[PDB]
Design a protein around this ligand. Structure first.
Ligand SMILES: Cc1cc2c(cc(C(=O)N[C@H](CO)c3ccc(S(=O)(=O)CC(=O)O)cc3)n2C)c(Cl)c1Cl
Ligand SMILES: Cc1cc2c(cc(C(=O)N[C@H](CO)c3ccc(S(=O)(=O)CC(=O)O)cc3)n2C)c(Cl)c1Cl
Lengths: 204, 210
């Protein structure tokens, strides 16, 4: 609740996967002018899968809906009626993977949510899928993710969170198709002020 | 045919607005360099902030509706679009001189004409808020390149996002190389969907003659 900053970064990560804005910026700083290399894809009419439909997940959904993206997802707690109010069609996990163009994770870190995006899951996904993780490290299996990026099963990945912070295994962050942030989800003057203030109202 | 690439240009602008606010390309470059800087890449929350959209045609109106879902206050200017017509798509129109002090973010969506050339100048940046962020995904020259560098070097402009330049590729790299500047090699229309739409709409016009 103290959320909108993690949701805005996730949305900004989605826009970066579609047009490769960080890669295009790094290319420019190197004195290059590569038009052909950074030919992207439109967000209008594309399917975004949202696994975890809490406070973050619903804000991402409403923001990405204004872009013409189809918002579908899953949550074991959130009823189909609650998800339908904010325009998210709930389907079972196995029916979500092949329809998705973009996938974002917004669940807490739990053993059941650890490795949610694995080799078996990625194989069920559409070829050239884009994955976002601005939640917690370990939700998307890093080993399974690098393999999918290597094979082309996953076209791109935007990672704010990792299993180890700072990560020693640089294979993911070094990959050209990977967008990265050093855990910047909550890193805003507006959210940290709200987090610092909301800890006092729950106290009293 | 400008209608065919309007949605792709609108999306990239929104992308550039997010990238300025959370320093995503700068954070990626730092991570790619093998660094971990949390309290260095301090972002800003877009909710409640004011976005000024100068030019309210197809791209200007599509940027507004997307940024409205982020809780951004969308204000702007267009001498052709009426204040009642702009209000129908959530844009509060005010005279050009009143827009500058209210903006946190400014984005230009006008065609290139002598009247639009140098729209963001030294006199224009002086009326702006200290720490304003500027987006130019329309045509190089609407935002005066010389004035923009002065604003970025004095702290008057906290950051710039430029897809376009007066010279393409730009010979002068002083803007491109600045730490608070993010850039793209004219990717505004560079998408399969817009390229196929523009490619179809131009072909039918040539067929229309006979
Ligand atoms: C296997 C599996 C288990 C799952 C989920 C989803 C949840 C869950 O806990 N849902 C609730 C919302 O009902 C929730 C609560 C706090 C956060 S959060 O702390 O990340 C910040 C936030 O988003 O508010 C996110 C989501 N669980 C236990 C999914 Cl999808 C799968 Cl597949
Ligand atoms: C001094 C001054 C003069 C201006 C404007 C605005 C226009 C203008 O022509 N407006 C119309 C829409 O009424 C229009 C047409 C095509 C495009 S476009 O699609 O080619 C570019 C894009 O949208 O990126 C954008 C806008 N004029 C002549 C402004 Cl604001 C100022 Cl200050």
């Amino acid at each position: 609740n103290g959320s909108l900053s993690a949701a805005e970064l996730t949305c900004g990560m989605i826009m970066c996967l579609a047009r490769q804005i960080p890669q295009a910026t790094a290319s420019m700083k190197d004195g290059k002018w590569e038009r052909k290399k950074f030919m992207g894809t439109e967000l209008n009419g594309k399917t975004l899968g949202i696994l975890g439909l809490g406070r973050i997940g619903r804000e991402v959904a409403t923001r990405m809906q204004s872009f013409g993206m189809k918002t579908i997802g899953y949550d074991p707690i959130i009823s189909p009626e609650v998800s339908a109010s904010f325009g998210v069609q709930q389907l079972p996990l196995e029916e979500i993977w092949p329809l998705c163009d973009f996938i974002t994770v917004h669940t807490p870190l739990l053993p059941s949510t650890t490795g949610l995006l694995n080799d078996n899951t990625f194989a069920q996904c559409k070829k050239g899928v884009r994955v976002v993780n601005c939640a917690r490290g370990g939700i998307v299996d890093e080993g399974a993710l690098l393999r999918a990026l290597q094979s082309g099963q996953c076209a791109g990945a935007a990672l704010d969170v990792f299993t180890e912070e700072p990560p020693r295994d640089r294979a993911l962050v070094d990959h050209e198709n990977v967008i990265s942030c050093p855990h910047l989800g909550a890193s805003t003057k507006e959210a940290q002020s709200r987090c610092g203030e909301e800890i006092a109202v729950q106290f009293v």
